[PDB]
Enzyme design. Sequence first.
Site, PDB file in Angstrom:
ATOM      1  N   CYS B 163       0.764  -1.245   0.000  1.00  0.00           N
ATOM      2  CA  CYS B 163       0.000   0.000   0.000  1.00  0.00           C
ATOM      3  C   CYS B 163       0.801   1.305   0.000  1.00  0.00           C
ATOM      4  O   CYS B 163       0.220   2.384   0.079  1.00  0.00           O
ATOM      5  CB  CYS B 163      -1.004  -0.009   1.159  1.00  0.00           C
ATOM      6  N   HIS B 298      -2.815   8.140   6.061  1.00  0.00           N
ATOM      7  CA  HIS B 298      -3.000   6.882   5.364  1.00  0.00           C
ATOM      8  C   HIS B 298      -4.451   6.521   5.685  1.00  0.00           C
ATOM      9  O   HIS B 298      -5.233   6.182   4.797  1.00  0.00           O
ATOM     10  CB  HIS B 298      -2.034   5.831   5.915  1.00  0.00           C
ATOM     11  N   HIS B 333      -9.536   2.710  -0.216  1.00  0.00           N
ATOM     12  CA  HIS B 333      -8.087   2.541  -0.334  1.00  0.00           C
ATOM     13  C   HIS B 333      -7.679   1.787  -1.599  1.00  0.00           C
ATOM     14  O   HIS B 333      -7.896   0.579  -1.711  1.00  0.00           O
ATOM     15  CB  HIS B 333      -7.532   1.803   0.885  1.00  0.00           C
TER      16      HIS B 333
HETATM   17  C1  LIG Z   1      -1.400  -2.739   1.862  1.00  0.00           C
HETATM   18  O1  LIG Z   1      -0.274  -2.634   2.390  1.00  0.00           O
HETATM   19  C2  LIG Z   1      -2.065  -4.101   1.935  1.00  0.00           C
HETATM   20  C3  LIG Z   1      -1.428  -5.093   0.975  1.00  0.00           C
HETATM   21  C4  LIG Z   1      -1.634  -4.635  -0.452  1.00  0.00           C
HETATM   22  C5  LIG Z   1      -1.201  -5.681  -1.461  1.00  0.00           C
HETATM   23  C6  LIG Z   1      -1.781  -5.346  -2.829  1.00  0.00           C
HETATM   24  C7  LIG Z   1      -1.544  -6.450  -3.845  1.00  0.00           C
HETATM   25  C8  LIG Z   1      -2.111  -7.792  -3.401  1.00  0.00           C
HETATM   26  C9  LIG Z   1      -2.003  -8.811  -4.531  1.00  0.00           C
HETATM   27  C10 LIG Z   1      -2.133 -10.246  -4.034  1.00  0.00           C
HETATM   28  C11 LIG Z   1      -3.493 -10.525  -3.420  1.00  0.00           C
HETATM   29  C12 LIG Z   1      -3.632 -11.943  -2.909  1.00  0.00           C
HETATM   30  N   LIG Z   2      -1.969   9.607   2.314  1.00  0.00           N
END
Ligand SMILES: *C(=O)CCCCCCCCCCC
Ligand SMILES: [N+]
Lengths: 406, 406
Positions: B163, B298, B333
């Site tokens: 993220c 965030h 988000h």
């Molecule tokens: C934010 O930090 C939470 C994690 C985000 C990951 C985004 C991509 C996930 C792809 C795989 C899903 C199973």
């Molecule tokens: N942000």
Amino acid sequence: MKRVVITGLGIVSSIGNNQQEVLASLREGRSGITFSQELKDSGMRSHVWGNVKLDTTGLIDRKVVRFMSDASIYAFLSMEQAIADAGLSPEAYQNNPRVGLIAGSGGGSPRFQVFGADAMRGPRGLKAVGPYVVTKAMASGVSACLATPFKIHGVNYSISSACATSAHCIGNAVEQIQLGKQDIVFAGGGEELCWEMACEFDAMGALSTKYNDTPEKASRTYDAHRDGFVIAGGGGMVVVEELEHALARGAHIYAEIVGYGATSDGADMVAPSGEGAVRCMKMAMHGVDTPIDYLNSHGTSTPVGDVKELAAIREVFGDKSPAISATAAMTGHSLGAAGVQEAIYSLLMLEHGFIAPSINIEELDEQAAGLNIVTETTDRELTTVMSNSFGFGGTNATLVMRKLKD
Amino acid sequence: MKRVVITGLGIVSSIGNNQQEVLASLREGRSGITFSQELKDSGMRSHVWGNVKLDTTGLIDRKVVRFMSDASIYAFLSMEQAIADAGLSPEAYQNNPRVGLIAGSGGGSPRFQVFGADAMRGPRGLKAVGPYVVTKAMASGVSACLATPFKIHGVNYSISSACATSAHCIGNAVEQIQLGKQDIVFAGGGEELCWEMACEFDAMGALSTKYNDTPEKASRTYDAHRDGFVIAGGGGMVVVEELEHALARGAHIYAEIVGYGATSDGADMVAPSGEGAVRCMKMAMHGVDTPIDYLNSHGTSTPVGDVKELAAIREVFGDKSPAISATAAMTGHSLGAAGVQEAIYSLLMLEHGFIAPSINIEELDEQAAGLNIVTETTDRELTTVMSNSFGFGGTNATLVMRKLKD
Ligand SMILES: *C(=O)CCCCCCCCCCC
Ligand SMILES: [N+]
Ligand SMILES: *C(=O)CCCCCCCCCCC
Ligand SMILES: [N+]
């Protein structure tokens, strides 16, 4: 600016589970390619791969490995090796804002992403998926799964650029040190090996399919009869460190990174333009007052790719072309992990004074004439080496490593 | 010691398909969250998301879009906007070694990865898969699919950090300019929206599930009854440029990036430590002697995450805490795309002099008492703004932007 050296390495590849086994394979010109029943059963045409011959069961703490996919596992093991090889202890690299990590993969984890969807579509839905798929499948898996358990406080993220992934990770680690932001950065990557991901390459006709009966001959870079690369998996990690910091602790220095090139073709999505590679190598060679003794080409054993790179090499060096060998002929192409593993093979050649042979060249390609492609293990006192990594999307990376004066 | 500014922006989000639509949504506190039959039909408990309300069909050349997944498409459209907004002609940024691109996604393309595996297991096998799945599913899809068609010749790769992804892309872009390696770098990212990816988050209980009947109220950062974040998709891109280069061509400057922080928690795999965020914000504030007028948190509307970040903010600013609002309450988000989109929201607030409201706070969490959380659109002359991005693996990114003097 700040000078940067490599003070430790770790690796898990098709030709060795550590640098000793890898060194032995390189010297012998041993192939890490084997027949894969898994790829065959999936319905693919390519039935060969460069798999990791290691039982990772119980090598990583249960509470830690539960969030990891194979790419992270291979990288984690590589990092443990690198840490020891560097002579670093927890008190020195853990909970230290001046120590970071940059490592990634080319495709995160196709296996767990497919597992997630398959499980979700089953009768148990969310319960079958479990709460550990995100960290296993996310693209940053390799960096996240290592920075967390190793208690890294500095930089932490993955750089992804297809088959140039781990090469850019190293280059970026160098930049973090040159910027004075970090004293040490663990850099590299990993890539899982599975039909889920391999079938996509077969679908575009990029994988070898005419040598399934003789696996060790499938990857044959520069051979007139090459027919695609052999997919491989594994991991690799190098300890990128600021020169003064390394000298101060009496670290063992493999070499100094004296050049790093990163460019873009801005041409074709899945084919190299060559023009980009020329600029990439020149960028990495800028300021390097010593000639390139050895060049570990990208050479994945593809019809167009192989010769396109050679043409670029001819353009850069002209008549003074360095010794060349494609280690991929032995190991296969590990995609995201290829950059760091090949940088490691190059460092081992520099460290042990020898050039790994470019195997399976039964009939040298016509467009490969006039070049010094080494086809037999040759002892030689190398001083400066270069490694190239190219990926889809016209992304190019070049690393130049040189021995440190006495 | 090169100074870096943002001279163009482009965005495709749940609250607008361009900066004008987004501006309107932000000022009106309009939610971009809707009910999703797709998520419900998949068997998920979370039936809400921040979808891109736009048919991208025909917006991109057929021969180009054939290699692209949704993340790349959103980023591509965002880049087109940024280029126009920056006033850059083809001859100014194309085929130029001094112009690069750094953009990524959090998970490449779960949809096409699953598509490939599904197809491969079908009666057509490889024929059903097709030769375009690799460029769509690879983690570097966003950078590869943009660098190629836009004729980028400089740096070309993706930074991936869950993220925080697009936030690190922007920071890295700043670093390339500071290193004097590039004059312009397009930075940002994109993320597709699909159950294939979303179910994984629901499986770990991270998504909101108690407000499916009232979608626009699901994302409620800082509300005592928040119950997880609302997944969203989309893209964003900004034109990162060296100051002199921007001034020379009379470019419109939104702000200068005066601070960039990137740290690691080295603690928990899916929960923030807070300690890492404190170091990140402090790092970004180094040398910044102007106060932070607005902080775009965030704040994804998670029980633990929301307050952990507020605690970190308290520690950094003490009794001089800045005005705070979590745009995620409106937009949801967007994972990998969140970083650049939120930096864009912040730049719009800075450019237009107003603070977007932190909506859906019916009962302020007790741990948020004593803070300046803006819950109503407020006109104000902002000068310096901060935006935080955190991701699994304990990866932290902070960006600080300030209006150029006169
Ligand atoms: C934010 O930090 C939470 C994690 C985000 C990951 C985004 C991509 C996930 C792809 C795989 C899903 C199973
Ligand atoms: N942000
Ligand atoms: C090397 O440049 C060829 C492309 C490698 C991309 C990384 C691996 C992608 C796996 C997911 C798609 C099948
Ligand atoms: N290489």
